[PDB]
Design an enzyme around this catalytic site. Sequence first.
Site, PDB file in Angstrom:
ATOM      1  N   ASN A 112       0.838  -1.191   0.000  1.00 22.83           N
ATOM      2  CA  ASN A 112       0.000   0.000   0.000  1.00 22.83           C
ATOM      3  C   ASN A 112       0.879   1.250   0.000  1.00 22.83           C
ATOM      4  O   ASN A 112       1.404   1.650   1.035  1.00 22.83           O
ATOM      5  CB  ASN A 112      -0.911  -0.021   1.229  1.00 22.83           C
ATOM      6  N   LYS A 139       0.007   4.167  -0.247  1.00 24.11           N
ATOM      7  CA  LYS A 139      -0.703   5.274   0.381  1.00 24.11           C
ATOM      8  C   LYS A 139      -0.572   6.574  -0.423  1.00 24.11           C
ATOM      9  O   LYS A 139      -0.650   6.555  -1.653  1.00 24.11           O
ATOM     10  CB  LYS A 139      -0.211   5.451   1.820  1.00 24.11           C
ATOM     11  N   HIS A 142      -9.536   0.899   4.838  1.00 22.09           N
ATOM     12  CA  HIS A 142      -8.266   1.054   5.523  1.00 22.09           C
ATOM     13  C   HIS A 142      -8.502   1.937   6.749  1.00 22.09           C
ATOM     14  O   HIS A 142      -9.322   2.859   6.709  1.00 22.09           O
ATOM     15  CB  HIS A 142      -7.231   1.689   4.597  1.00 22.09           C
ATOM     16  N   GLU A 151      -5.639  -4.844  10.703  1.00 16.34           N
ATOM     17  CA  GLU A 151      -4.779  -3.756  11.123  1.00 16.34           C
ATOM     18  C   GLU A 151      -4.850  -3.560  12.626  1.00 16.34           C
ATOM     19  O   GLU A 151      -5.883  -3.151  13.157  1.00 16.34           O
ATOM     20  CB  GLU A 151      -5.197  -2.438  10.486  1.00 16.34           C
ATOM     21  N   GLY A 167       2.410   2.509  14.977  1.00 19.00           N
ATOM     22  CA  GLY A 167       3.046   3.782  15.274  1.00 19.00           C
ATOM     23  C   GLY A 167       2.673   4.384  16.618  1.00 19.00           C
ATOM     24  O   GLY A 167       2.954   5.553  16.877  1.00 19.00           O
ATOM     25  N   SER A 215       2.416  -2.972  11.269  1.00 18.38           N
ATOM     26  CA  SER A 215       3.685  -2.523  10.740  1.00 18.38           C
ATOM     27  C   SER A 215       4.537  -3.719  10.353  1.00 18.38           C
ATOM     28  O   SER A 215       4.931  -4.528  11.182  1.00 18.38           O
ATOM     29  CB  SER A 215       4.392  -1.707  11.822  1.00 18.38           C
ATOM     30  N   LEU A 224      -0.191  -6.696   4.272  1.00 13.42           N
ATOM     31  CA  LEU A 224      -0.501  -5.500   3.608  1.00 13.42           C
ATOM     32  C   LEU A 224       0.475  -4.559   4.183  1.00 13.42           C
ATOM     33  O   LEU A 224       0.377  -4.146   5.331  1.00 13.42           O
ATOM     34  CB  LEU A 224      -1.918  -5.083   3.999  1.00 13.42           C
ATOM     35  N   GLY A 231       2.864  -1.239   4.600  1.00 16.40           N
ATOM     36  CA  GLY A 231       2.775   0.206   4.523  1.00 16.40           C
ATOM     37  C   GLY A 231       4.046   0.866   4.024  1.00 16.40           C
ATOM     38  O   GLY A 231       4.418   0.718   2.864  1.00 16.40           O
TER      39      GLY A 231
END
Lengths: 260, 260
Positions: B10, B12, B101, B173, B179, B219, B238, B240
């Site tokens: 992704n 983003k 998402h 997720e 984070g 992550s 998936l 990031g």
Amino acid sequence: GAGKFVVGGNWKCNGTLASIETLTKGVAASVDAELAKKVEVIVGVPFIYIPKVQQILAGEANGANILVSAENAWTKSGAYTGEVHVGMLVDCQVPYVILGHSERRQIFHESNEQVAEKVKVAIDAGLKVIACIGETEAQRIANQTEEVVAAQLKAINNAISKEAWKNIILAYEPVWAIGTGKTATPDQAQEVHQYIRKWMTENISKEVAEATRIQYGGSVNPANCNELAKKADIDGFLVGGASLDAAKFKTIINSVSEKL
Amino acid sequence: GAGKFVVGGNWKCNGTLASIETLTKGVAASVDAELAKKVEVIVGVPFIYIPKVQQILAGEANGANILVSAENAWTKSGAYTGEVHVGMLVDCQVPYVILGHSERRQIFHESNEQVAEKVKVAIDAGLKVIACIGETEAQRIANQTEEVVAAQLKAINNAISKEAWKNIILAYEPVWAIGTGKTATPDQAQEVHQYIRKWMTENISKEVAEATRIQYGGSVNPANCNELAKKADIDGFLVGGASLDAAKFKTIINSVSEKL
């Protein structure tokens, strides 16, 4: 206004590769060199079709006379899945972006300040902007038309410099005339456009006010474009549905004649 | 899961034509025929760059091994300025779309029902979907992980048929650990993945539960991918930030070595 008449065609969330090729070719065909001298023409294209439209215009004799505009833009890079950043538009050589459209303010809850931030970032990056403003049915009923529009304009002005206005086209959307059963008359449209002009004159300068094109963003079709174009403070149009038909859009572009 | 390992990158809201050309070529170069048999590789691309990525992949030897996905999509055509609807993705031959998402659920307030609506129309149009689900820190400490994930899944199931699930890849997720300063261990991830599998088994069928790939979408990086890939119910990732680096991405793709 003293600005060059400008007609934008907001295709909104509509189009296919096939329909867009036909539409784009039709729009370019309708604006030759002679007409281009008297009217700026912009088409608002869904993100995914911007490259296609750019490709089509590149192969058209009058392609250079049609400017491509995105229909929205985001201002933060990074963790924002689904968003297209202002910088991506610039990277892709897109000169314009429509910001603060009533559909985004209402459906996607973009506030006056959030719209202002988008305008600020867009202009700082070099984009030209069609900034949309306008009051709702409830706001007009409450006689808050001027207060609401002033607030929207103030949010934008507080965020940018006097020079930044040089890239801005304002588009007045009589949201109160949208699916309400109340249609805006040329007189009503002109009344708000006049006040927008006044707001800019009072808060910025008479020069900036007169130089800034104020497009009418309400319902515009081949039957009412001339009557609207006759109004002193209507410097163009941000066309909705009619922009999806090159023949209808052509008639609207040509209503610039009311100004000559 | 009994499904084929699937790794989605992704991107983003990141990229330029230059960075994307380098990245796309690197990603394609990293997945040859033999690896493609073990892992399905998908890249989530900003709308405006989808045509470019498609063009690049068409010119690379391993291009067919990389599938393009959009990062979001609106329900349908119409007066939704700024949006790109599912039909446009199909028209542009984009096989996948990432929906729900966390960034969109939180920043753009997409509800469980709104996400479900998007999944439904996406599958109706023929798109394959990576549907994202997951709980926040507040929900996890309140010991509401199962109920929250169950509600997100139920919304989706309520809107689609049993057969529609063939097109779905779920991505969990752990928002509570992305984070935030909290690290989701492989055991914690496996636990939620197990319950997602259990939920599908009881609410749909064991067949659908086992066929549906569940990607871990927290992550993921070169340092932690293998220990996650070893988990029974982690059928892919998936990715990031790391997906913006071809070397890091292929490292993650190769963690399929924990499956075989």
